[PDB]
Structures are given as structure tokens and as C-alpha cells.
């Protein structure tokens, strides 16, 4: 629903609170949980962990015990960590990052996958899975045939690879934002000097966003076509809806993805275009940033001797009521 | 009788509205394609026309246009408040700051207000006299109040009357006149006052 | 590794999502199934209503929140002079992560898991029939590395997520039994025994479905490693194989440890029902013990006990 | 001598178990071998300890412990009140369903917290020091004292310490003795009178 | 193209000022001999000029010129307060006129025919200022010439008749105006 | 199977208290007729019994019995303090003195105290003054529990020293002056 989800959330008190220190700690855990091979994490390891993170924020040493326990305690209520009583374990308990926990932590620690060969490769694989499912869908079969050779592949491999492609995009979205910042600071330090580097960072992401969109368009319809063949093989055996609604979302998500792919590009030209205007405006007419610099200092010294700009101001025309 | 091109202009469909805008202190920037293109072609003749009221039609190095009323002006003249000046300056600053390039030209009343308090004695601004919120608010409203006047003057273009977002125009440079020619504040302001560009407070 | 904190502090990474904002983030993520600053403010408005508050600051607040969402990297902004609000918005990886957790459907189905395992088995076989055969980089990249990383490791990670959702489930039943027994005492026994049994079953099933598959998967993962370990160029096709084998093990292990632990808790609950409730059906003793604690000093007493003198030795 | 007593006595388990019981340890199901051993020769070990004027007692909840009579040849002791207070909260935590998740494992902080909750903190501090009202330096002496009580109770077999440390511990059935003044639905101070007559307790005056 | 006699009006030295005065809402009467003859000479061609601004160059029947803006005006407009309006209706009827007036009379004549209730809402010495203010404006509108300095010892202009009621039946002046006042 | 005499021993009315006593570290000498006789009679078997606990039932050369626990003793162990040992060695020195034979083996807290200051380096004697005379009453009290001393009243004043004090004597060969060796022990 709409305001019903809001009650549900405040009915379960869903919340997340992770100040830098806490987040670092949660992050410190994932880092070690990642290198997991010996088994789960122990209360000993968690504190040993919280201990280093505490030293990182140059604070008291004795309070550790209680804070370490206070911390771990809400990491649990906030549904970020899970606790299990285990005598064998140092501290008599083991902790596991929750799904939510893996989520939040992954974003920060899990390395980012930025490759067109990746996408290409992904699309290929999806193409195969989608072809076979298409053929197999029309070649009919008992119930185990549909649930295993049509539905399943779509649902557990296709729907999965799309969600990844999508994620990669959102990831690519943060790189764009990242390049914008590089360009901002680059310019904020070398002024006219950076003009070269920026255009290169600019030129490079346009090429990237282009290769990606090509790939998606190149496979987009061969793919979309098969989802259709399947969407038809159901026209017949109507009462097989879970396989219809799946083909529907898979189609929507692909459109959703292909759509955005085009839009970002169009959006980048907006930024590019604007970055060129700026240079041509705040840098060219002030090649050594002398004006700008003095204008800033001008803001601090204004009160020592204030002045005001003049402007024409004709008397309005007074009229009756 | 009259110089040919003086008439071609005064008769052009764009004039009455432009004239009305210019006499009200508006600065005609590049965003106003037609009006700007117009003033560009009849610059000299409209120069003749406005002179007749003791007003200099002026084109700045940045390309915008505005009237600069002389002492013996047939069209009354005014001066921005100290807060106005301050806002205008912040606007000019934001206009030359690369740290905002992601905005693509569209700023917020919030980004403005913060930038102001970031670069100016919050104390002295409140000088329009303590730290009371009944005074704090009065600043944010006055700021907005100033932002709207500069909107009427052409320094800024609101992205919706209701909106709290806006675009900045080249006209904000007038706010940096006291720094165009490297010098001493008391000196520059001496030339700005002599030229009719500025006034004392 | 403590560099993590340095880096974390520099970029000032933080997440602050009170139930207040979270609803917003959810409401947003809900509707997202692009977004303009316009639609994004509407959303925040509907949430503002659910908390019956002020409208005087709705405008200023809604934007104040959206910025928070932008500084905490939950939301990504894109200036689009033509969209309503002159801005477009997209949930980020962190944004989608956090929101799926609160909206994605459960997946504790045994059939689901077998299908996943069946699908994985096939790919892991195909990659073995091929990686055994051989070919150019494209063969090993498109017919070995590609299915192991974009399809197999992906399905494993999904199975890993099902177990964690199962850990969550596990906690829930634990909390529920605490509540059930603490409120209806003897009357909640039959209910509690049922929740203990239902959970043990689920666990036992997923794990049994997993173990039954393990051995074969591990087998083909071993074929792919037998061709890749020799050649000094196909390394990348090995740090993956080794990586998946290692992950398949971590899953089969925890599946087991999870059941061990559960069996323990189940025993504990039963012992408790025997010691604390069957021997105090009317729940009087606990009340009395408690009263005896506060009223103890009124007339203090103490237990006796054997206390033989220790053997006093030399030196 | 009965053949079976000789058997019990020749068993490799007896000596250390015997020392334990003489030092006041209570033996519950947790000590698998010893408890199995006692169940086996209960009747005979009963007679043996009787020679010391001591009763080998198996409580209704099943644990064993020696209860010296007043003519005992094995020295008797009496817990302090702080001990009884801690003992009673131990038994309390053991019956608390709101703790089941702990599977019986608890922490010094958990014990201490639950103690201040149900007990008269005011007078609780008086045990530590004659006249002390909140003196944060005394709460520390109270904490250390509660800590010492847990330790003494470990020795008595009321609790098991979890690891190389003393911070966490598991509770035992033997902790039911602390609720003896109420187990038998009666007049709390009537049961106490009965407990005293049986050598289970001694009244604490001042 | 542009009407020749229009440029001739435009080029005339008197324009710049007149133009600014007209656009201000100032009424041009007989007093301003040179201008008023200018607005007579080219009335029609200037009638066209200001039309480009969606303003009409009216000439009240009494002979005085003024610029009336349309809803569609291109010249910024301002509307006098209801108080200013009540002070104009009085300044009319006061115009036994063959005497220069005083803030006194205007203040008296006001508190007289002005409702002792509604006249107190225009100020919801309390009104002795909003009156010296209104009059300050009306002077700039060309309907009162300050004779002295800044003092309130003025002289009424015929332009005030724009505040006069409608003598249509053909009755008497002063009460027709007096009536409207009430 | 347990020997017939072991049982008979544990069945003796004297066993229970003696057993408790022996486990506390008490030394059973001759000024305790009934018990001592008892141990002389069943030494062979009680020897085996106590071995089960990893404790050796020992008869010293001077005749008294006592349990000496091993490192693996299954019986709770305690330990005398340096002052307790010091006092014991001094009690031994006294027993060795010639006066002892003409006092029915009876001495005084003061005498003990005197001899204590005289031989033990008065500096290290502080390691653990009218207090040090009361603290010596403690050591002398535990030592009484151990069977080294017998009190001539409920108080402390004067006491009787038994042959079990040799547990504190020095290794002596035939011909070695016991007193010189004893104070050499007390001294090093």
C-alpha cells in the first residue's frame, strides 16, 4: 500500500543508526567476516574488532567493555548482526552479518565491477538461458517441465543477471558522480591548467556510457524477442500465471534498464555542455583566477567600508482604485 | 527629422516592454535573446535616446545592459541595501565556483544562504542585534527578500515563482566592480561613486 | 587493515535512518518499481502525513531530507532542467540494498533451493565438459569463467542470502517463544513445541537439500581446477574455482552449525518447560522468589553446607 | 562392610567426588559421571557419610550435597547474606523465560543488573560499608563483593564458569536450594523455621 | 515606419521630463503651460505612442491630461490606498473656493463627512500623518501644489475633478461630491 | 575388591574424626593415645586408602603420622605462611632445648617470641610490633590445629610442644648438633 507501509515500519520500529564510528565497526566486522574460512565470528573476535576501531578514534580505554557491548547490542536490535549462543565459541557466542548487514557492508567493501566485457558476457549468458527457455517453453511438457525448464531459469538465472546488470548501472552512476567531483576539484586547484584533464575525464566517460548503451541495444531485442515467444507459449496453457508475470517483469526491467542507459548519456551531455560554458565564462575571462580570488576576500572585508550599486528606478504609475 | 535608425528601434515591437524594464533597474542579460540582440543592434541610438533623460545606457565588459542614472537624472535612481550587496556578491561567487558544476547552473536558496554565512561574519549580518531567533529568521527572510529584488533586477532567474531554485546571470559581476581594478577599497569605491556606478552608505 | 577507519572517517561515511526517514526511503523505493525531484517530494509528503505534523516546514523539511539521502549516498542526484523539480533521482547500490531487505519476499522454499541447485549443477557441468576440452581465450572466458562468475557465484550468493534470512527467522521464533511462555505460561507449551518443530524441519530440509547436492557440484568444480592449475595463464579461472569451492563449503558448514545450535536451543527450551513450568504450573514460585528477594532483609537466613578444612601443607 | 559400599569406595570416581562433597559442592546432572555414580550407590554412600554425622541429601530437583548434622565430624558453614541474595537471583534468572535465548549462559553484568533491580540497593550497599549512600567507590566494592559471591557459589557447584575467564557462567539445578523458603507453599517465615530445624539453614542476626 | 509628427513630438526637448511625469501617474494641467500646450499640439500622435504600452493618454473633460493604464499595461502600476482615495474626493469638493488651503480644513472637512467608524479603519494625530502623506503623493500626481516648502499650506489643481462624482441629472456640484463622500 | 582390614578400619568408631583430622593436615603424635595406636594398627591399609587420593600416609622417624599430598592430590590443599613456618622451626628449636625436659615440655608465648626475635633477622621479621606478637598467636593457633602444640588452657599463655614439631626440624646426621643445624635452618 502507501501509508500502510509507514505504520508497518513504525509498528516494527524499523530504523538504522550508524555514526562514523559504528559504521566503521560494522565495516571492520565484514572485512574479517569476508576472510572467513575457519567458521563464524566469535564474541571474542567482535570485541577484539571493536577494540581496534575504538583505538582508531583516540578515546578512553577502560569504557571499551561496556561500549563494545552496547554497540554489538544495538547492531543486533537494528537487525544488522545476528547472535547465536555457543559454548564452544570464545565468548560463548557467534555473530553473523544479517542480510541487511551484508547489504550495507557490501556497498563499501565489496570491490566495484566496471567492465563492458562483463556486461557483454552477462548479456550473452542471459541470451542463452533465454533462448533455451523459449524453445523449451513451446516444446511443452508436464508440470515439472515448466517449473524446471522455463520458470526456474528465468527466475533464478535471468532475473538474477538483470538485477546485476541493473546494479552495475547504479554503480556506473556513482562513478559518474565521482568523475564530476574529480573535475570540480581539478578545476578548483589548477584553474585554467586543469582544462586539459577535465576534457579527458569528460571525453572518457562519454565513450564509456556509449559502449555500454550500444551493447544493451545490440542484445536488447534479440532478448526481448524470446521473452515474447515464451509470453506466447502461455497464451495456450493459460493457468500458468507465475510464468507469465515473470516474463512481464523481466520485460519491464529490461526496458527500464535500456531506457535509463539512454537517459544517462543524454544527461551527461547536459553536464559536459555546462562544463564547457563554465570554462568559457569563469576561467577564460579570468585566466589566473585573480578576479574570483579578490571577489571572495571582498566578501569578508565588505563591512570595513560598505558600498552599494546604483540602478535606475522609475516611479511606478499611481492609479485610482 | 530624426536619425533613421533611432526610429527603427523606438518602433520595434520589443521597445516599450524593454524600455519599461530598463527604467525599472533591470539588467538585460544574454538569457533574454531578443531583447539582448535588440539592444545590441541599436545600442548607439538607444544610447542617444536615454541620454536625453541624463542616463547612460551601459554595456558592461561581460556583455549585459543596464541604465546608470546620472546625478541630474529624469528617471529616479536607487541603491541596493547592504544585505543586497552581500547577496549579490555571494551570487557572483557561486557563479565562478567550480565546486558547484554538478548543479549545471541551477542553485538553491539553501545553497546561497549557507555560502553566505560560510564567508561572512554571521554576527555582522545580524546587524540587520544579538543572536535571537526572532532575529535569526529575520535574516533568512530578508535574504530571500533580497534575492527576489535581484530577481527583478535580472541578476537571477527563479525556476518557478514558488520554487526555491534559481539560475544566475552574468549581471552579478556588477557586484565585483569594486575589484575589477586592483586596488584599495576606499579608492575603487571612489571611482565607482564618481562614475555613478555606486553610492556610499 | 585499520586503514578502513581512516578512509571511513575521511569520507565521513555514515547512515542515519530514523524510522522517520526510513519510511520515506521505503516509500521511495516502493514507488520506484525515473524519479523527479517532484515525485520525490510528493512521497515525502505522504510520509509527513502519516506522522500528523506540521505543513509549515514540510517544504523545507522534505528538501532537507532529500539532501541527507544524498550526503549519506542512499540517493543519487541528476540535474535535469526539464524534469519536475529540475532534478531526477535514483536509488544507489546502498539504497537498493537497504530497501530490498525491507520489501523482498521470503525464500525459504525447499523446491526453490533445489531448482537453484539443479540450475547450478548444469552450468557447473557444461563448464567442466568444456574447460576439459579446451580452446582460445574466448572459449575459457565465455564458456568457463563467464558461467562461473555471472551465474554460479551469483546463485550461491543467493543461497547464502537464504540462510541468513533463515538465521533471522531463527531469532524470531526464539523471541516469540520467550513472549509466548512469559505470557501464557503452561498454555503456551503446545504452541512453543510447534514453533520448535516447524523451524527444525525447515532447517533440516534446506540443509539436507544442500548436502545432497554438494558432492557433485564440488566434483565438477574439481574438474575445472584440473585443467586450470597446470597452465600458467588461466589463473583467473582458478582463483574463481577455488573461490566457489570455498564458498560452497562455508554454506554447507554453516548449514550444519546452524542446525547444531538450533538443536541445542530446542533442548534447552524443553528442559526449561520441564524444570520451570511443569514443576510450577500455577506460576507461583517465581513470584514468591522475587518477593523473597526484596523482603529478604526483613528476616535474613542462610544455607548451610559442608566445608571441610583444607589440608594445611608446608612451605 | 556391604559389598556394594566397598564397590562404590573402590571406584575411580569416589576420591575426588568425596573431596568435592566435603568441600560443599552440590552435584547435579551437569556432572554426568559423578551424578550417575551417586545415583548408583546412593543408598550406600548415604550410610558412609552417616558415619561422619552427615546426611548425603538428594534434593527433589535431583542434585546431591552433604548436609552436616549438628554433631558432624565434618565442619559446617553458612553463606553470607550477599551470597543468599546472589543465590536467589541466580535461581531467579534460571526460571526467567525472558532469558531462554541465553540457553543458560549469563554474564557478571547480567547477574549484577538483575540484582540491583529486585534488591534494596540502599541496604545492599550497607553490606559493603557501614554507612554509604551511593558512594560510587562503594558500588565498586559492592560489585567486587558480588563477584566474590559468584566465585564462592561456583565452588559450591551452583554455577559453572564458561572459559579462561570469570565473566560468563552457566547455572545449575542446585540453585533451587536458595528458594527452599518458598518451594513448599507456606508462610515464608514458617518454612524458614522448618529449614532451620533440618540443618538446611541458619538464621542471620546482628 | 513611424509617423513623422510623432518623431517631432519625441525629439521635442519637453518630452523626456513630461514622459517621466506622465508615466508616474502625474496629471498635467493648465499650470504647466509649456507641457500642456505640448499635450495639446500632439495629443493624437502621443495617443498612439502610449497605446504601444497599453496605456491611454486621456484628457479629462476639464482639460487636464493623464495616463490611464489598462489591465494589460506595460508600465508598472500602483493603486492609491482607500485613504488616499478619500482625501482626493475631499480635495475636490473643497475646490466658496475663490480664496490656497490648509491641512486643518482638509482634516476637519474629513472627520466631518467621513463615517466616525469607517474613517477609523483606514488607521485600524493618528490620522494627522496618513493625511499629510496622502497629500504628499497627490502633489506628485499634479493635484496639489505646495506653496511654501514642505509645509501643508497648498493650492488645489483642477486635476482633482478626477475625484468628482457624476453630475449627470444636472444637479449641484458640492453636494453631489459631498454625497459620494458619505 | 577392598581388603578385609581396610573395611574393619573404616568401620572403627575412631576413623571419621581421625580422617577429617588427617585431611586438614593434622599430625597425630603420641599425646593422643587412642588415635595413634589406631594408625599403628592399620597403617598398611590406610596407606593404600589414602593413596587413592594421591596423598601419602607417612609415619615419621620420630613416630607421628600425617598425610603429605602429592602434586596430583585429590584433597583440597592449603599452605602455611612464612611466619607459620618460622614459628614451627622455632618451636622445634625449643623442643630441642635442655629446659624442655624440665618443663614437662611446656613453654610460653613470650619465650617463643623471645627466641623468635633472637634467631630470625628482625628486619625480615617485619615482612608480616605488639601486633607481630599477636600474629604469632595466629601461627601458633594454626599450628595447634596441625597437632604441633597443645594448649594448657583456652587461652594461649603457656603451651605443650609435641614430637610432631620435627616436621620442622633440619636434616640431621648422627653427630650433627641439632640446635646448631636448626638455627642454621631458621637462619637460611
Curated annotation (Swiss-Prot), chain A:
Residues 202-230 are annotated as: Leucine-zipper. Disulfide bonds: none annotated. Keywords: Calcium, Cell cycle, Cell division, Chromosome partition, Cytoplasm, DNA condensation. GO terms for molecular function: calcium ion binding. The keyword Cell division applies. Involved in chromosome condensation, segregation and cell cycle progression. May participate in facilitating chromosome segregation by condensation DNA from both sides of a centrally located replisome during cell division. Not required for mini-F plasmid partitioning. Probably acts via its interaction with MukB and MukE. Overexpression results in anucleate cells. It has a calcium binding activity. Interacts, and probably forms a ternary complex, with MukE and MukB via its C-terminal region. The complex formation is stimulated by calcium or magnesium. It is required for an interaction between MukE and MukB. This is Chromosome partition protein MukF. The lineage of its organism: Bacteria, Pseudomonadati, Pseudomonadota, Gammaproteobacteria, Enterobacterales.
Curated annotation (Swiss-Prot), chain C:
GO terms for cellular component: condensin complex; cytoplasm; nucleoid. GO terms for molecular function: calcium ion binding. One of its GO terms (biological process) is chromosome condensation. It comes from the Bacteria. Residues 196-224 are annotated as: Leucine-zipper. Its main location: cytoplasm. Keywords: Calcium, Cell cycle, Cell division, Chromosome partition, Cytoplasm, DNA condensation. It is found in: Cytoplasm, Nucleoid. Belongs to the MukF family. Involved in chromosome condensation, segregation and cell cycle progression. May participate in facilitating chromosome segregation by condensation DNA from both sides of a centrally located replisome during cell division. Not required for mini-F plasmid partitioning. Probably acts via its interaction with MukB and MukE. Overexpression results in anucleate cells. It has a calcium binding activity. Interacts, and probably forms a ternary complex, with MukE and MukB via its C-terminal region. The complex formation is stimulated by calcium or magnesium. It is required for an interaction between MukE and MukB. This is Chromosome partition protein MukF. It comes from Escherichia coli (strain K12).
